[PDB]
Write an enzyme that holds these catalytic residues in place. Structure first.
Site, PDB file in Angstrom:
ATOM      1  CD  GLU A  88      -0.246 102.010 -26.103  1.00  0.00           C
ATOM      2  OE1 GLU A  88       0.719 102.233 -26.867  1.00  0.00           O
ATOM      3  OE2 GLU A  88      -0.655 100.854 -25.880  1.00  0.00           O
ATOM      4  CG  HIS A 147      -8.307  92.764 -34.024  1.00  0.00           C
ATOM      5  ND1 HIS A 147      -7.902  91.745 -33.191  1.00  0.00           N
ATOM      6  CD2 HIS A 147      -7.185  93.209 -34.642  1.00  0.00           C
ATOM      7  CE1 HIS A 147      -6.597  91.577 -33.297  1.00  0.00           C
ATOM      8  NE2 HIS A 147      -6.139  92.454 -34.172  1.00  0.00           N
ATOM      9  CG  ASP A 187     -20.530  92.769 -36.410  1.00  0.00           C
ATOM     10  OD1 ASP A 187     -19.503  93.044 -35.756  1.00  0.00           O
ATOM     11  OD2 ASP A 187     -20.898  91.590 -36.602  1.00  0.00           O
TER      12      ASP A 187
HETATM   13  C1  HEM Z   1      -1.340  89.913 -41.602  1.00  0.00           C
HETATM   14  C2  HEM Z   1      -2.078  90.877 -40.838  1.00  0.00           C
HETATM   15  C3  HEM Z   1      -1.795  91.398 -39.565  1.00  0.00           C
HETATM   16  C4  HEM Z   1      -1.227  90.774 -38.521  1.00  0.00           C
HETATM   17  C5  HEM Z   1      -0.866  89.306 -38.448  1.00  0.00           C
HETATM   18  C6  HEM Z   1      -1.085  91.749 -37.469  1.00  0.00           C
HETATM   19  C7  HEM Z   1      -0.491  91.514 -36.238  1.00  0.00           C
HETATM   20  C8  HEM Z   1      -0.304  92.473 -35.244  1.00  0.00           C
HETATM   21  C9  HEM Z   1       0.321  92.225 -33.963  1.00  0.00           C
HETATM   22  C10 HEM Z   1       0.905  90.926 -33.413  1.00  0.00           C
HETATM   23  C11 HEM Z   1       0.299  93.384 -33.283  1.00  0.00           C
HETATM   24  C12 HEM Z   1       0.781  93.486 -31.866  1.00  0.00           C
HETATM   25  C13 HEM Z   1      -0.320  93.677 -30.845  1.00  0.00           C
HETATM   26  C14 HEM Z   1       0.186  93.526 -29.434  1.00  0.00           C
HETATM   27  O1  HEM Z   1       0.760  92.467 -29.109  1.00  0.00           O
HETATM   28  O2  HEM Z   1       0.018  94.474 -28.644  1.00  0.00           O
HETATM   29  C15 HEM Z   1      -0.287  94.375 -34.150  1.00  0.00           C
HETATM   30  C16 HEM Z   1      -0.509  95.696 -33.810  1.00  0.00           C
HETATM   31  C17 HEM Z   1      -1.169  96.631 -34.600  1.00  0.00           C
HETATM   32  N1  HEM Z   1      -1.725  96.395 -35.839  1.00  0.00           N
HETATM   33 FE1  HEM Z   1      -1.639  94.721 -36.843  1.00  0.00          FE
HETATM   34  N2  HEM Z   1      -1.598  92.963 -37.876  1.00  0.00           N
HETATM   35  C18 HEM Z   1      -2.138  92.726 -39.126  1.00  0.00           C
HETATM   36  C19 HEM Z   1      -2.921  93.623 -39.843  1.00  0.00           C
HETATM   37  C20 HEM Z   1      -3.260  94.904 -39.438  1.00  0.00           C
HETATM   38  C21 HEM Z   1      -4.158  95.790 -40.155  1.00  0.00           C
HETATM   39  C22 HEM Z   1      -4.752  95.484 -41.536  1.00  0.00           C
HETATM   40  C23 HEM Z   1      -4.341  96.880 -39.373  1.00  0.00           C
HETATM   41  C24 HEM Z   1      -5.202  97.970 -39.524  1.00  0.00           C
HETATM   42  C25 HEM Z   1      -5.561  98.692 -40.729  1.00  0.00           C
HETATM   43  C26 HEM Z   1      -3.454  96.730 -38.234  1.00  0.00           C
HETATM   44  C27 HEM Z   1      -3.242  97.699 -37.259  1.00  0.00           C
HETATM   45  C28 HEM Z   1      -2.412  97.552 -36.160  1.00  0.00           C
HETATM   46  C29 HEM Z   1      -2.097  98.586 -35.215  1.00  0.00           C
HETATM   47  C30 HEM Z   1      -2.458 100.080 -35.214  1.00  0.00           C
HETATM   48  C31 HEM Z   1      -1.372  98.009 -34.237  1.00  0.00           C
HETATM   49  C32 HEM Z   1      -0.839  98.738 -33.037  1.00  0.00           C
HETATM   50  C33 HEM Z   1      -1.597  98.813 -31.734  1.00  0.00           C
HETATM   51  C34 HEM Z   1      -0.848  99.612 -30.690  1.00  0.00           C
HETATM   52  O3  HEM Z   1       0.244 100.139 -30.994  1.00  0.00           O
HETATM   53  O4  HEM Z   1      -1.351  99.742 -29.559  1.00  0.00           O
HETATM   54  N3  HEM Z   1      -2.834  95.502 -38.267  1.00  0.00           N
HETATM   55  N4  HEM Z   1      -0.660  93.802 -35.343  1.00  0.00           N
HETATM   56 CA    CA Z   2     -17.040  92.298 -35.889  1.00  0.00          CA
HETATM   57 MN    MN Z   3      -0.574  98.772 -27.580  1.00  0.00          MN
END
Ligand code: HEM
Ligand code: CA
Ligand code: MN
Ligand SMILES: *[C@@H]1O[C@H](CO)[C@@H](O[C@@H]2O[C@H](CO)[C@@H](O)[C@H](O)[C@H]2NC(C)=O)[C@H](O)[C@H]1NC(C)=O
Ligand code: CA
Length: 357
Positions: free
Chosen positions: A35, A46, A64
């Site tokens: 987690e 982000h 940054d």
């Molecule tokens: C079109 C692009 C992307 C969208 C719209 C997107 C959207 C999301 C959303 C909605 C979540 C759920 C977060 C939550 O509600 O807890 C998520 C989780 C996550 N995303 Fe993305 N994401 C994108 C790109 C990326 C990229 C480029 C990375 C990193 C290289 C990334 C890494 C992660 C990771 C690791 C999680 C998991 C966090 C966790 O399990 O605690 N995402 N993303």
């Molecule tokens: Ca920044």
């Molecule tokens: Mn999470």
């Protein structure tokens, strides 16, 4: 050079990252792809993406450390919901390892976190980003409900990312879960192996959706092929954006191209991350401290396989020019529950610090 622990590093400036890596593992990661590790990998993205060529420097400085430097600003934008946890967990290290900038810290932490996931590549790590910047403006973070056009434009405007690099970056959704998309359920996995950096996510998004993990009325969410969950073992969730990219004419073949192509997927992700990690900086001005990033955990080497209760008949293919590989199916008539904890259990709370975000 050689550090105070005998480790022969490339540049003496890199020596400070060695004690930081140990502290991160011991304190919040515990050498696992859990987690806390997942949250940090998300923060890395982000922090970096909040930059805009068209709008100019005043819009944001990219990678940054602004999330840490201005904790009451960005963390509170809608699109950043849930980012507060990673911020508060990292702030204590900023204050402690005070010779390393907030920006360097963010990127290094993500590299360390990822090395705990079997199959993940060893990320390039350049150091020397300034410890001063500005709070970014709202609207630079792509969202689940965004169209493919809007998403591709956002990445192009941030750093000239091609569609291929955008899909490559989504390889991180192979070790991701959601806590805020649906407020009735927590930690809903994007693929069946949320603790393994493999190609399952690319395969599973191409399957027909049959239900929902929790509520069926959430923005940015679409039907999942493995919704079944019990207790803490929440079912798989599917994001509209991931679904959209898997079927759009511009990205469909790229997405399919990663199915069961582990080495290709990992190398492409490493490449795309090299660019992302230096957004808002000139790479010729940063020192190379890659030899200080921990060696990643190896995978077992097994091919991708259809999870129990799904098969070739459930695929919704969109790439007309490439042959989908022949994969086996895991035996079973019903869907298996996706484990909430890497050890198998349902009880595995991560470390969490209180903070300003
Ligand atoms: C079109 C692009 C992307 C969208 C719209 C997107 C959207 C999301 C959303 C909605 C979540 C759920 C977060 C939550 O509600 O807890 C998520 C989780 C996550 N995303 Fe993305 N994401 C994108 C790109 C990326 C990229 C480029 C990375 C990193 C290289 C990334 C890494 C992660 C990771 C690791 C999680 C998991 C966090 C966790 O399990 O605690 N995402 N993303
Ligand atoms: Ca920044
Ligand atoms: Mn999470
Ligand atoms: C980078 O900037 C941050 C924010 O000003 C610095 O953080 C402070 O660090 C000292 C110890 O050096 C702590 O006592 C302060 O409480 C920290 N402030 C906050 C708001 O957390 C950090 O030290 C700076 N580091 C470098 C290398 O420039
Ligand atoms: Ca996975």
């Amino acid at each position: 050079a050689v550090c105070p622990d005998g480790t022969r590093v490339s540049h003496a400036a890199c020596c400070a990252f060695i004690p930081l890596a140990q502290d991160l593992q011991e304190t919040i990661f515990q050498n696992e792809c859990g987690e806390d590790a997942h949250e940090v990998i998300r923060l890395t993205f982000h922090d970096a993406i909040a930059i805009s060529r068209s709008q100019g420097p005043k819009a944001g400085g990219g990678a940054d450390g602004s999330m840490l430097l201005f904790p009451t600003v960005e963390p509170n934008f809608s699109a950043n919901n849930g980012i507060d946890d990673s911020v508060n967990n990292l702030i204590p290290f900023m204050q402690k390892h005070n010779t390393i900038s907030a920006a360097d810290l963010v990127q290094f932490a993500g590299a360390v976190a990822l090395s705990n996931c079997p199959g993940a590549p060893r990320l390039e790590f350049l150091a020397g980003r300034p410890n001063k910047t500005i709070a970014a403006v709202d609207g630079l973070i792509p969202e689940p409900q965004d169209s493919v056009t809007k998403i591709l434009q956002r990445f192009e405007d941030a750093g000239g990312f091609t569609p291929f690099e955008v899909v490559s970056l989504l390889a991180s959704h192979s070790v991701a879960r959601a806590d805020k998309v649906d407020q009735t359920i927590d930690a809903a996995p994007f693929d069946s192996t949320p603790f393994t950096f493999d190609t399952q996510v690319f395969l599973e998004v191409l399957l027909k959706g049959v239900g929902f993990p929790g509520s069926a009325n959430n923005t940015g969410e679409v039907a999942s092929p493995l919704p079944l969950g019990s207790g803490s073992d929440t079912g798989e969730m599917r994001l509209q954006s991931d679904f959209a990219l898997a079927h759009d004419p511009r990205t469909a073949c790229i997405w399919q191209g990663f199915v069961n192509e582990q080495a290709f997927m990992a190398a492409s992700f490493r490449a795309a991350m090299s660019k992302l990690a230096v957004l808002g900086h000139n790479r010729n001005s940063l020192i190379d401290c890659s030899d200080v990033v921990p060696v990643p955990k190896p995978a077992t080497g097994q091919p991708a396989m259809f999870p129990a209760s799904t098969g070739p008949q459930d695929l919704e293919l969109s790439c007309p020019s490439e042959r989908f590989p022949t994969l086996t199916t895991q035996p079973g008539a019903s869907q298996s529950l996706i484990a909430h904890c890497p050890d198998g259990s349902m009880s595995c709370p991560g470390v969490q610090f209180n903070g300003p975000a």
